Protein backbone atom coordinates (compact mmCIF):
# COMPACT_ATOMS: atom_id res chain seq x y z
CA UNK A 1 0.00 0.00 0.00
CA UNK A 2 2.69 2.47 1.07
CA UNK A 3 4.62 1.35 -2.00
CA UNK A 4 2.22 2.60 -4.68
CA UNK A 5 2.39 5.96 -2.90
CA UNK A 6 6.23 6.32 -3.24
CA UNK A 7 5.25 5.27 -6.76
CA UNK A 8 2.46 7.80 -7.24
CA UNK A 9 4.17 10.97 -6.10
CA UNK A 10 7.51 9.98 -7.66
CA UNK A 11 5.57 9.97 -10.90
CA UNK A 12 5.07 13.67 -10.40
CA UNK A 13 8.81 14.23 -10.01
CA UNK A 14 9.25 12.42 -13.34
CA UNK A 15 6.73 14.66 -15.09
CA UNK A 16 8.62 17.59 -13.59
CA UNK A 17 12.18 16.79 -14.70
CA UNK A 18 10.83 15.62 -18.04
CA UNK A 19 10.16 19.32 -18.58
CA UNK A 20 13.94 19.85 -18.25
CA UNK A 21 15.72 16.86 -19.71
CA UNK A 22 13.13 14.39 -21.07
CA UNK A 23 15.81 12.18 -22.62
CA UNK A 24 17.05 11.25 -19.16
CA UNK A 25 13.77 10.72 -17.30
CA UNK A 26 12.22 8.73 -20.15
CA UNK A 27 15.32 6.54 -20.46
CA UNK A 28 15.25 6.00 -16.69
CA UNK A 29 11.68 4.74 -16.90
CA UNK A 30 11.67 2.54 -20.02
CA UNK A 31 15.34 1.54 -19.51
CA UNK A 32 16.12 1.85 -23.24
CA UNK A 33 18.38 4.65 -24.14
CA UNK A 34 15.86 7.02 -25.66
CA UNK A 35 16.35 10.55 -26.95
CA UNK A 36 13.42 12.94 -26.62
CA UNK A 37 12.64 16.62 -26.97
CA UNK A 38 10.49 18.89 -24.83
CA UNK A 39 7.50 20.50 -26.49
CA UNK A 40 4.85 22.08 -24.29
CA UNK A 41 2.74 19.74 -22.26
CA UNK A 42 3.65 16.86 -24.50
CA UNK A 43 7.29 15.77 -25.00
CA UNK A 44 8.02 14.15 -28.45
CA UNK A 45 10.28 11.21 -29.23
CA UNK A 46 12.99 11.83 -31.93
CA UNK A 47 15.32 9.09 -33.30
CA UNK A 48 19.11 8.97 -33.69
CA UNK A 49 21.85 8.48 -36.31
CA UNK A 50 25.30 7.12 -35.43
CA UNK A 51 28.11 9.08 -37.08
CA UNK A 52 31.70 8.27 -38.07
CA UNK A 53 32.75 7.91 -34.49
CA UNK A 54 36.43 8.55 -35.15
CA UNK A 55 36.72 11.14 -35.90
CA UNK A 56 35.00 13.71 -33.75
CA UNK A 57 37.07 16.66 -32.64
CA UNK A 58 36.77 18.96 -29.62
CA UNK A 59 37.53 22.64 -30.23
CA UNK A 60 39.56 24.32 -27.50
CA UNK A 61 37.79 27.67 -27.27
CA UNK A 62 34.27 27.76 -25.81
CA UNK A 63 33.88 31.48 -26.39
CA UNK A 64 31.68 32.33 -29.33
CA UNK A 65 32.75 34.88 -31.93
CA UNK A 66 31.04 37.13 -31.62
CA UNK A 67 30.90 38.14 -28.84
CA UNK A 68 31.85 37.98 -25.22
CA UNK A 69 30.07 37.60 -23.11
CA UNK A 70 28.47 34.79 -25.11
CA UNK A 71 30.05 31.42 -24.27
CA UNK A 72 29.11 27.81 -25.07
CA UNK A 73 27.94 25.77 -22.09
CA UNK A 74 29.37 22.71 -23.81
CA UNK A 75 32.55 22.27 -25.88
CA UNK A 76 31.96 22.59 -29.62
CA UNK A 77 32.68 19.67 -31.89
CA UNK A 78 33.46 18.74 -35.49
CA UNK A 79 32.30 15.37 -36.74
CA UNK A 80 31.57 13.30 -39.82
CA UNK A 81 28.71 11.12 -40.85
CA UNK A 82 30.09 8.08 -42.72
CA UNK A 83 30.09 7.02 -45.44
CA UNK A 84 30.68 10.73 -46.06
CA UNK A 85 33.09 13.59 -45.44
CA UNK A 86 31.10 16.77 -44.93
CA UNK A 87 32.55 18.44 -41.84
CA UNK A 88 29.78 19.58 -39.49
CA UNK A 89 29.64 21.61 -36.29
CA UNK A 90 27.82 19.96 -33.42
CA UNK A 91 28.28 20.66 -29.72
CA UNK A 92 29.07 17.64 -27.51
CA UNK A 93 25.88 16.85 -25.63
CA UNK A 94 26.21 14.38 -22.77
CA UNK A 95 26.31 10.59 -23.16
CA UNK A 96 27.95 10.99 -26.57
CA UNK A 97 25.08 12.76 -28.30
CA UNK A 98 26.24 15.36 -30.78
CA UNK A 99 24.05 18.44 -30.91
CA UNK A 100 22.68 19.79 -34.20
CA UNK A 101 21.67 23.45 -33.89
CA UNK A 102 20.42 23.96 -30.34
CA UNK A 103 23.74 25.26 -29.02
CA UNK A 104 23.65 25.48 -25.21
CA UNK A 105 25.09 28.99 -24.77
CA UNK A 106 24.81 30.41 -21.88
CA UNK A 107 26.51 33.73 -21.24
CA UNK A 108 30.10 34.36 -20.09
CA UNK A 109 30.61 34.16 -16.32
CA UNK A 110 34.16 34.53 -14.97
CA UNK A 111 35.87 32.59 -13.64
CA UNK A 112 34.62 29.24 -14.88
CA UNK A 113 35.97 25.73 -14.49
CA UNK A 114 33.92 22.92 -15.98
CA UNK A 115 35.02 19.54 -17.30
CA UNK A 116 33.24 17.53 -19.96
CA UNK A 117 33.23 13.80 -20.60
CA UNK A 118 33.06 12.61 -24.20
CA UNK A 119 33.47 8.90 -24.79
CA UNK A 120 36.18 7.96 -22.32
CA UNK A 121 38.21 11.13 -21.79
CA UNK A 122 37.46 14.22 -19.70
CA UNK A 123 38.25 17.71 -20.99
CA UNK A 124 38.89 20.40 -18.38
CA UNK A 125 38.01 23.92 -19.51
CA UNK A 126 39.37 26.48 -17.05
CA UNK A 127 38.23 29.83 -18.44
CA UNK A 128 36.12 28.69 -21.38
CA UNK A 129 39.55 27.87 -22.76
CA UNK A 130 40.90 24.35 -22.62
CA UNK A 131 43.51 23.48 -19.96
CA UNK A 132 44.07 19.75 -19.66
CA UNK A 133 42.91 16.23 -20.27
CA UNK A 134 41.60 14.70 -17.05
CA UNK A 135 41.99 11.09 -15.91
CA UNK A 136 38.44 9.69 -16.07
CA UNK A 137 39.43 6.98 -13.59
CA UNK A 138 40.72 9.54 -11.09
CA UNK A 139 37.18 10.79 -10.58
CA UNK A 140 35.41 8.76 -7.88
CA UNK A 141 31.77 7.95 -8.59
CA UNK A 142 28.80 8.36 -6.25
CA UNK A 143 27.38 4.98 -5.37
CA UNK A 144 23.91 5.60 -3.99
CA UNK A 145 22.10 2.25 -3.82
CA UNK A 146 19.92 1.83 -0.76
CA UNK A 147 20.41 -1.92 -0.76
CA UNK B 1 25.79 21.91 13.35
CA UNK B 2 25.15 24.07 10.29
CA UNK B 3 27.55 26.93 11.15
CA UNK B 4 28.09 30.20 9.31
CA UNK B 5 30.31 28.86 6.60
CA UNK B 6 32.07 30.00 3.46
CA UNK B 7 32.83 27.12 1.08
CA UNK B 8 35.34 26.90 -1.78
CA UNK B 9 37.47 24.41 -3.70
CA UNK B 10 40.98 24.36 -2.21
CA UNK B 11 43.15 22.10 -4.36
CA UNK B 12 42.47 20.85 -7.89
CA UNK B 13 41.02 17.57 -6.67
CA UNK B 14 38.70 16.07 -5.65
CA UNK B 15 35.61 15.48 -7.73
CA UNK B 16 32.67 13.07 -7.80
CA UNK B 17 30.74 12.05 -10.88
CA UNK B 18 27.49 10.18 -11.43
CA UNK B 19 27.08 7.16 -13.65
CA UNK B 20 24.65 4.29 -14.18
CA UNK B 21 26.33 2.11 -11.59
CA UNK B 22 23.40 0.05 -10.25
CA UNK B 23 22.23 -2.84 -12.42
CA UNK B 24 19.22 -5.05 -11.76
CA UNK C 1 13.21 -6.92 -7.18
CA UNK C 2 10.80 -4.01 -7.65
CA UNK C 3 12.84 -2.20 -5.00
CA UNK C 4 16.13 -1.93 -6.89
CA UNK C 5 14.08 -0.41 -9.72
CA UNK C 6 12.68 2.50 -7.59
CA UNK C 7 16.37 2.61 -6.69
CA UNK C 8 17.72 2.54 -10.25
CA UNK C 9 15.59 5.22 -11.86
CA UNK C 10 15.66 7.44 -8.75
CA UNK C 11 19.39 7.45 -9.28
CA UNK C 12 18.74 9.24 -12.53
CA UNK C 13 16.70 11.92 -10.76
CA UNK C 14 19.70 12.42 -8.44
CA UNK C 15 22.10 12.86 -11.35
CA UNK C 16 19.60 15.36 -12.74
CA UNK C 17 19.15 17.66 -9.74
CA UNK C 18 22.85 17.37 -9.01
CA UNK C 19 23.20 19.48 -12.16
CA UNK C 20 21.20 22.19 -10.32
CA UNK C 21 22.08 22.08 -6.65
CA UNK C 22 24.70 19.35 -6.07
CA UNK C 23 25.18 20.36 -2.43
CA UNK C 24 21.65 19.20 -1.65
CA UNK C 25 21.47 15.94 -3.60
CA UNK C 26 24.92 14.81 -2.46
CA UNK C 27 24.11 15.61 1.17
CA UNK C 28 20.83 13.70 0.80
CA UNK C 29 22.71 10.62 -0.36
CA UNK C 30 25.75 10.48 1.93
CA UNK C 31 23.82 12.09 4.84
CA UNK C 32 26.79 14.30 5.81
CA UNK C 33 26.28 17.93 5.22
CA UNK C 34 28.47 18.36 2.16
CA UNK C 35 29.00 21.43 0.01
CA UNK C 36 29.70 20.86 -3.68
CA UNK C 37 29.93 22.81 -6.91
CA UNK C 38 28.69 21.94 -10.40
CA UNK C 39 31.28 21.65 -13.12
CA UNK C 40 30.29 20.00 -16.38
CA UNK C 41 29.65 16.30 -16.28
CA UNK C 42 31.59 16.00 -13.06
CA UNK C 43 30.59 17.92 -9.91
CA UNK C 44 33.54 18.78 -7.55
CA UNK C 45 33.60 18.74 -3.75
CA UNK C 46 34.76 22.01 -2.04
CA UNK C 47 35.30 22.38 1.75
CA UNK C 48 34.01 24.97 4.23
CA UNK C 49 35.22 27.54 6.80
C1 LIG D 1 35.64 8.46 -40.98
O2 LIG D 1 35.77 7.08 -40.57
C3 LIG D 1 36.46 6.26 -41.53
C4 LIG D 1 36.42 4.85 -40.99
O5 LIG D 1 37.59 4.56 -40.24
C6 LIG D 1 37.87 6.79 -41.74
O7 LIG D 1 38.55 5.99 -42.70
C8 LIG D 1 37.81 8.24 -42.19
O9 LIG D 1 39.13 8.77 -42.35
C10 LIG D 1 37.03 9.08 -41.18
N11 LIG D 1 36.96 10.47 -41.60
C12 LIG D 1 37.57 11.45 -40.92
C13 LIG D 1 37.43 12.83 -41.49
O14 LIG D 1 38.21 11.22 -39.89
MG1 LIG E 1 11.15 5.43 -3.80
In chain C, residues with a C-beta closer than 8 Å to the C-beta of B23 are: 8
CB neighbour list of residue A48: distance below 8 Å, 6 or more residues apart? A35, A97
Query: Using CA atoms, how far apart are residues A137 and A79, in angstroms rounded to an integer?
Result: 26
Q: Does B11 touch chain C (CB under 8 A)?
A: no
Task: Label residue A80 exposed, middle or buried (CB < 10 Å: 0-12, 13-18, 19+).
Answer: middle
Three-state DSSP class for C17? helix
What Å distances lie between residue B3 and C26, C32, C45, C47, CA to CA? 18, 14, 18, 13
What kind and span of H or E run contains A22? helix A22-30
Resolution limit, Å: 3.6
Encode burial over A131-140: b for 16+ CB neighbours within 10 A, e otherwise: eeebeeeebe
Contact: A141, B18; criterion CB under 8 Å: yes
Is C46:C34 a contact under the CB 8 Å cutoff?
no
Half-sphere CA count of A44, side-chain side, radius 13 A? 4
Query: Using CA atoms, how far apart are residues A137 and C35, in angstroms rounded to an integer?
Result: 22
Q: Does B17 touch chain C (CB under 8 A)?
A: yes
Packed helices C2-18 and A2-18: angle between N→C axes, nearest 10 degrees: 30
Amino acid sequence: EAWCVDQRRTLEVFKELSKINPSAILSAIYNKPIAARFMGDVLGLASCVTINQTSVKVLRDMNVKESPGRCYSRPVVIFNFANSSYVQYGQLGEDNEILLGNHRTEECQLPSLKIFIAGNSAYEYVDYLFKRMIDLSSISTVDSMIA
Amino acid sequence: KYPYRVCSMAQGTDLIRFERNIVC
